């Protein structure tokens, strides 16, 4: 989606990796593959084929996706310099950044009474100055591995979470969870949550109590581990 010219629409290919290399990538990993282009002798009917149809496909080798540091980590012993080299693009307003870098930090959790405790920090933000919330959002979403982004109306309540679909040509439909569903071990960053919708606060509020996305929609009380 960074190459596709002004007058173009992205398209997909198929991946068939067999044998050992299975289970070697998740959805939405930006990955680079070295393999072969190979056509596909789709034999069967003698008139729907028989064109020399050649519906090609790909063969696999690898899924590369664009302590070792310990001696150099010995070279440096400092706490504050992260703010000094994280997001240089604005001078000052360190306090917001250090507040973020805490969420980058983590490390608070316990399972007493059998029950868990939310060990994730969730900041709220009001303001319209020129802040470049868009700046820090892009910065974090790039450096924070396993990142996400949504906007003020791009994802209604079903999209950011799981949802449902309709088609009388492929079978039944599933949940196909959204960015908020997918962003575990990380952050999904909404921009202008104030302006999305009032009832939209509901399902997100459900995930306030973490890892609980209840759905009595596909005949379940499913969880999804938000």
């Amino acid at each position: 989606s960074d190459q596709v010219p002004v007058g173009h629409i992205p398209r997909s290919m198929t991946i068939m990796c067999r044998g050992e290399v299975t289970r070697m990538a998740q959805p939405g990993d930006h990955i680079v593959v070295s393999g072969v282009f190979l056509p596909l002798m789709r034999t069967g009917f003698a008139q729907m084929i028989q064109g020399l149809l050649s519906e090609t496909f790909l063969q696999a080798h690898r899924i590369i996706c664009i302590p070792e540091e310990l001696e150099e980590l010995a070279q440096d012993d400092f706490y504050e310099r992260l703010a000094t080299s994280l997001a240089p693009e604005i001078y000052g307003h360190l306090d917001v950044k250090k507040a973020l870098l805490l969420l980058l930090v983590g490390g608070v959790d316990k399972r007493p009474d059998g029950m868990k405790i939310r060990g994730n920090i969730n900041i709220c933000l009001m303001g319209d100055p020129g802040v470049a919330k868009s700046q820090l959002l892009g910065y974090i979403s790039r450096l924070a591995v396993r990142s996400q982004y949504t906007t003020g109306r791009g994802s209604s309540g079903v999209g950011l979470t799981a949802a449902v679909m309709k088609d009388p040509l492929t079978g039944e439909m599933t949940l196909e969870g959204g960015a908020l569903v997918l962003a575990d071990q990380g952050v999904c960053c909404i921009d202008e949550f104030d302006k999305m919708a009032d009832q939209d606060r509901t399902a997100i509020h459900e995930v306030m109590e973490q890892q609980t996305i209840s759905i009595a929609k596909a005949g379940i009380m499913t969880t999804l581990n938000a």
Binding site: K110, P112, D113, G157, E172, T202, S214, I215, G219, M221
Partner: protein
């Protein structure tokens, strides 16, 4: 079932500490308004029916349901999660995440020839189990008004163009009701607060309050206790003995071969005190009782008789109602 350990079965019934002792067990770490663990008193030594073997009429089921009202992020999920993490019939729910009509088994497209079947409903598979519901004044009018009957009727008339019947299912209910507002607005008796009338807001026996003590006093306690739940690195086996399983079996015996009756003793109280129950009805912006909660009282009668050893009715039990009720029912000052 085990005949071996009969000793302690009788031992725990005749011990008046039932009020709190097992209730003290349930929240393992939390005192969180432990008049709510006495509200957990409501709940187990299992729940007898006045089924109607004599006349056969009317199907008077002894159902139980209460809610845990909101306006503060209190443990109105955590208990419900403690339960669902313990009871197998385990589900968690809330408004705006799912449909009101999840009793459907949808035929979006099927592996059939459009022999449209609605195989099994979801929210009703809790056969005497529980579905936890949260954030209750969240949904539209159709949602949460549609259920105005199943609560004490357990029927679901499937009167659609498809296949038809009158089915059965009955279970337990609890949620985290919320008014239109975050905080209960002061100066203002409770019937004004939730947007339900003095028939539907004043419906149950009691739908129980959850406030903050307006001072630091209560605040630091469970902090001081359970700040160090990370840092305690141990658990104290006190005289409130953490019953590993010695609790979990007696309740299973609690329903088997003695059978609570109701004779002539413990019923004249609110036979007579229905005077006191209803004559507070002369008033608007105040509230009295209505004649489904007296049913909830005769249902309250069932539990305490066998345990404490008179399966015929004793009279004190109704006090538990007043111990419960007027805690927010004669709190009707104006």
């Amino acid at each position: 079932f085990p005949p071996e350990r009969v000793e302690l079965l009788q031992l725990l019934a005749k011990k008046p500490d039932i009020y709190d002792r097992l209730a003290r067990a349930i929240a393992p770490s939390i005192y969180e308004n432990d008049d709510i663990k006495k509200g957990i008193l409501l709940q187990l030594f299992g729940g007898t029916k006045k089924k109607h073997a004599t006349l056969g009429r009317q199907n008077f089921r002894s159902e139980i349901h209460l809610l845990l009202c909101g306006d503060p992020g209190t443990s109105k999920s955590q208990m419900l999660q403690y339960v669902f993490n313990l009871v197998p019939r385990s589900q968690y729910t809330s408004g705006r995440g799912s449909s009101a009509v999840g009793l459907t088994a949808y035929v979006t497209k099927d592996p059939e020839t459009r022999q449209l079947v609605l195989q099994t409903g979801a929210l009703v598979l809790a056969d005497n189990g529980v579905c936890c519901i949260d954030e209750f004044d969240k949904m539209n009018d159709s949602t949460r008004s549609v259920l105005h009957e199943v609560m004490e009727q357990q029927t679901l008339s499937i009167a659609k163009a498809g296949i038809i019947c009158q089915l059965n299912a009955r279970t337990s209910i609890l949620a985290a009701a919320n008014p239109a507002e975050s905080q209960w607005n002061k100066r203002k008796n409770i019937i004004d607060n939730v947007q339900l009338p003095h028939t539907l807001l004043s419906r149950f026996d009691l739908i129980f309050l959850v406030l903050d003590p307006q001072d630091e006093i209560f605040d630091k306690r469970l902090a001081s206790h359970l700040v160090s739940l990370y840092y305690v690195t141990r658990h104290e086996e006190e005289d409130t003995m953490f019953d590993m399983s010695v609790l979990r079996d007696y309740i299973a015996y609690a329903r088997e071969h003695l059978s609570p009756t109701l004779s002539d003793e413990a019923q004249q109280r609110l036979i007579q005190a229905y005077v006191d129950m209803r004559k507070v009805g002369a008033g608007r912006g105040q509230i009295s009782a209505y004649p489904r909660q007296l049913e909830s009282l005769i249902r309250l009668s069932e539990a305490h008789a066998k345990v404490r050893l008179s399966n015929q009715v004793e009279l004190l039990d109704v006090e538990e109602a007043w111990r419960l009720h007027r805690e927010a029912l004669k709190q009707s000052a104006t």
